[PDB]
Amino acid sequence: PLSPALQQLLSLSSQRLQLADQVAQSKAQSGKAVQDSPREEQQLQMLAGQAGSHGVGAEQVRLLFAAQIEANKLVQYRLLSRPLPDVDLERIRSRLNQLNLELLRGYAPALAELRVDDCRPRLNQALQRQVRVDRLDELHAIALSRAAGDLCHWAELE
Amino acid sequence: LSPALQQLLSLSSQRLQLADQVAQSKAQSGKAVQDSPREEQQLQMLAGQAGSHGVGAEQVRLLFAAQIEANKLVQYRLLSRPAVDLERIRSRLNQLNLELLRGYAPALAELRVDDCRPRLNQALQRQVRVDRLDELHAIALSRAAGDLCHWAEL
Numbered sequence A: 001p002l003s004p005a006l007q008q009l010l011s012l013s014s015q016r017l018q019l020a021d022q023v024a025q026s027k028a029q030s031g032k033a034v035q036d037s038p039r040e041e042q043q044l045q046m047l048a049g050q051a052g053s054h055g056v057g058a059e060q061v062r063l064l065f066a067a068q069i070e071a072n073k074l075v076q077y078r079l080l081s082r083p084l085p086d087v088d089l090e091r092i093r094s095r096l097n098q099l100n101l102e103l104l105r106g107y108a109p110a111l112a113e114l115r116v117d118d119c120r121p122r123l124n125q126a127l128q129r130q131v132r133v134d135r136l137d138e139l140h141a142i143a144l145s146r147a148a149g150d151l152c153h154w155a156e157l158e
Numbered sequence B: 001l002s003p004a005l006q007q008l009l010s011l012s013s014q015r016l017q018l019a020d021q022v023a024q025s026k027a028q029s030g031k032a033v034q035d036s037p038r039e040e041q042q043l044q045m046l047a048g049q050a051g052s053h054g055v056g057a058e059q060v061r062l063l064f065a066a067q068i069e070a071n072k073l074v075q076y077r078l079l080s081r082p083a084v085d086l087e088r089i090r091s092r093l094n095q096l097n098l099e100l101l102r103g104y105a106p107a108l109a110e111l112r113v114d115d116c117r118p119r120l121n122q123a124l125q126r127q128v129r130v131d132r133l134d135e136l137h138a139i140a141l142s143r144a145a146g147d148l149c150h151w152a153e154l
Helices: A004-018 A020-030 A037-048 A058-080 A089-114 A119-133 A138-148 B003-017 B019-029 B036-047 B057-080 B086-111 B116-131 B135-145
Strands: none
Touching: A004 A020, A004 A058, A004 A089, A004 A119, A004 A138, A020 A058, A020 A089, A037 A058, A058 A089, A058 A138, A058 B057, A058 B135, A089 A119, A119 A138, A119 B057, A138 B057, A138 B135, B003 B019, B003 B057, B003 B086, B003 B116, B003 B135, B019 B057, B019 B086, B036 B057, B036 B086, B057 B086, B057 B135, B086 B116, B116 B135
């Protein structure tokens, strides 16, 4: 079966985690930690507050974005842990906000596509398809599976 | 060799090698990778023991949040591509957590240096080479190390 809304969610997720590479460059210079727990909590609270104007639950939104943020972090930690191949943060932030809003806009139809008896198959096929579309390397492919998290379970929350 | 740090990473490596068996369990049981109540209960259980192991409560939460996330990223990956005694696996994880906690203070001391990321990165690759970690598990090990360099100066 087709799962277009899911495929969209994953394309957005792919774009978002691809920004990690540039964040990791920023942080090799600023000395800033990959993780900022208060800041991440604040972001989750702000995104959850938008759930009602996109037809989804607050908790569903916090779960989605916690997974997005973790996907981003695992790329950053890996890149900082090896030699860097060798950044405008305001442009990164504006791209993040745009992608976040598109994720919110697409989340309710993706959750509806997931409320099926073959969710894991559909998810796995959509992940592999996205990896192939975006020519993701192994690190970024791992990140994408991380960004999808437990979507199959989150679909059956509400 | 930075030996305490090396041992902290070896213990991390051992812990994240169990993720493969947790993933198998969940493939068969249908349980979610993530269980937020369970994870928070674990972080509370361990952070409360910080003082007795010569470290701070926040340092301990940070370490174990990274351990748990490292485990989760292996599980999600394995479930996304093509029998386990879970009570035994979770017992082994418990033993590894206690070993991590005892080894934490001496590792943090080794990280209070002006070349922390070079030492960390060399320790990470050494561990990858010694344990023959594949790319997934090497990535997971970098995740487990997290922001150790920053946590050492809390």
